[PDB]
Ligand binder design. Sequence first.
Ligand SMILES: [Zn+2]
Ligand SMILES: [Zn+2]
Lengths: 304, 304
Amino acid sequence: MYIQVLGSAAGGGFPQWNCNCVNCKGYRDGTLKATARTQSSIALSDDGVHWILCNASPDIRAQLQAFAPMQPARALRDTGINAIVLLDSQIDHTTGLLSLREGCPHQVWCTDMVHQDLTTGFPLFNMLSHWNGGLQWNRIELEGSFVIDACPNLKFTPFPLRSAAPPYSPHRFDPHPGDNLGLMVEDTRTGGKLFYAPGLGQVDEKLLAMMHGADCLLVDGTLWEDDEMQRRGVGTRTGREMGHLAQNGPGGMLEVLDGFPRQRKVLIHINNTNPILDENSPERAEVLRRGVEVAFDGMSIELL
Amino acid sequence: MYIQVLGSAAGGGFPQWNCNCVNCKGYRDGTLKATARTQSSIALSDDGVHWILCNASPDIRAQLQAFAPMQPARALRDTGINAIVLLDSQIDHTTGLLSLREGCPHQVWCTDMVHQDLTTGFPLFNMLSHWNGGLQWNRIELEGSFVIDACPNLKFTPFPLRSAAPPYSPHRFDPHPGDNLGLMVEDTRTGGKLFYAPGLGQVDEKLLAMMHGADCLLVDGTLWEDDEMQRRGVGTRTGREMGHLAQNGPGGMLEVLDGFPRQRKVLIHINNTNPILDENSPERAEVLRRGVEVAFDGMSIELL
Ligand SMILES: [Zn+2]
Ligand SMILES: [Zn+2]
């Protein structure tokens, strides 16, 4: 199984178009060691030639250009994508599709709740249907596992992730399971298991239980402190909107990860406010020492 | 008046995500002198501090980063944009807005027909309304001129451009005037007049007439030959879909521009297939000799 990190930032990526905070005002000022990041998004494959896109970010164009396998040039008008999985119906996880319209049809994998939002509040499916077949919806049942034709060696098993639909959803006040869910990918050939959850509110008994059975833990590292938005003074919300659950602890990520030493633990979906975006920073050190790698654009994780 | 070229490509920009043609397969192969281009889009201003965005492309993020004035950093959470103008409701001219949601409200200028599409087929307005005020629609009457508060020295006078609404429009088969229109910007302080039309099917008597009264002609240079899609073998349509009217002539652009020597003539909205994308190319020479500059990302045109 080949895991490619196309995007590693969050929300407005990094630096954010309209944010002049420490990390952003800093990065632009050349007075801060850090690397720009596009909206979180990873690709998956078993043969390294056929890839399944996980969440289509608004930085889809640049992200594809930066990865050669996304363009095998095995023929004029050809792509390295064979299917896309949607973990929710957020704008920053589905806007990319609009940019893939010139290459339809695409096999989109998403629950019924998400497919509902994508045919109503944000009619990506309706819109694109006017583009050579459009998108072929593939339901992601709330129970069980699925497998895509392009990569028959990858076994997907999505787990429920207590969350709420985007503000444009016809049921934003009526949270149904299937709105936002994590992913458990297993390489049926070797047995390897990747635990992907760029969106985590708080772990429980059922989560941790299945986490230990994973070789690689790709959890979200949005904010260092539950109220990063408060210190930086750029946001109102806290530990709830756009990747929650800080890492500082207690009850934090860095803490819960401690019970997972025999496995690769990486932090993806980093917000522009997170201090772990500063190479030579104190909070960065704590993450490295704890044995947790901070995801970055271009990163290539593999299990085999 | 300060004219900034944020995007100069067309449709899938350049190189196109899924296109392996001569210019694209070439550019990636380092065996072709050319520069990457983002989706067509230009910015305008009279004071160089307040800018009015013309069409919000899907490459809005990268485009803003590449232009310092788009981020005056005069305060945390601040942008250099004060208003956006929409010349139509196409996906590649309005998707950018979704990425500007974290900084609402925005003043969006567009006709009633476009505003209709943006509240139905592609509900950008509905969707964004859930983001601090959202977007404040400013009607662009089919007759007359308008002026935005941020730049009181710029006078906009849009002219009708016989075209059709996008395939997701509830009236895609019922073409109404106001669907797609060009723009005539005048610097009321100096008198200067910029003629912007990244989408031109064919000029007439009323067009040419008003064109001579413009100091700068920023016309579209999508395809060199009416059937670029045919030679390259990547598209079906011809001289009608995504910037039409070749430049080779006769009846072409390079031809009609001849009657406009006393003024700056630039070609923007270039398609990936256009051979004028090859620095050292024969078709490129013909354009330069004819006195027509080929727009590029980062280009800064000024009249004063
Ligand atoms: Zn920031
Ligand atoms: Zn091409």
